[PDB]
Amino acid sequence: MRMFRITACVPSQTRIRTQRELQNTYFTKLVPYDNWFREQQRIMKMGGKIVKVELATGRPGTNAGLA
């Protein structure tokens, strides 16, 4: 299936976490196409800034065979 290569930064707003939080603060990721809407909405209601997003796999305008 077609995948999204995304990169975003999410800050902490409620607590000062005393453990190492850089890896889940800033990350580059591979999310699926059907889960990308809910993942983006989750991090974006969380309040992060997404810096980059591309189609890692697949091609635009694919009528069939994208899975």
Partner: protein
């Protein structure tokens, strides 16, 4: 994943038309080649581990790559390279069955050249390993089937190189 059949369907859908004779001829060619594809896939699955072991034994073992100071010295790196070669064999078998290398472009050739350049993986040594796998499979599954397997094999070799 794009195969010959889905390529025919998508090439029909981009103009919205039905299937003409021009799209019919390549589909008939795929239907003619599919029996040889299934036979070659059965032989490759029958000897999947032994091809990898024999090509590793006569291609890179007891050399400077597996010597200390080489990339393939450590047992972790050795198991990683064995997993990589098994993945290349299995996904090239997938491409041989599907009739297209889009599975290689979408699953294997997605951010691997930069990963190998970052990790210092020897491109020439992987080329030699791919050629050893290709010639062992060409010796094992047959002449025409081995050459058709080697089409996807040197396509993914040129993609990774």
């Amino acid at each position: 994943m794009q195969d010959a059949i889905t390529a025919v369907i998508n090439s029909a859908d981009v103009q919205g038309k039905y299937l003409d004779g021009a799209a019919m001829d390549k589909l008939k060619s795929y239907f003619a080649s599919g029996e040889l594809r299934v036979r070659a896939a059965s032989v490759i699955s029958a000897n999947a581990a032994t091809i990898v072991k024999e090509a590793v034994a006569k291609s890179l073992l007891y050399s400077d790559v597996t010597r200390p100071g080489g990339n393939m010295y450590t047992t972790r790196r050795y198991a990683a390279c064995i997993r990589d070669l098994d993945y290349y064999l299995r996904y090239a078998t997938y491409a041989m069955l599907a009739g297209d290398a889009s599975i290689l472009d979408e699953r294997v050739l997605n951010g691997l050249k930069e990963t190998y350049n970052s990790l210092g993986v020897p491109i020439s040594s992987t080329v030699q390993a791919i050629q050893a796998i290709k010639e062992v499979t060409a010796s094992l599954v047959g002449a025409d089937a081995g050459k058709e397997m080697g089409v996807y094999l040197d396509y993914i070799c040129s993609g990774l190189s």
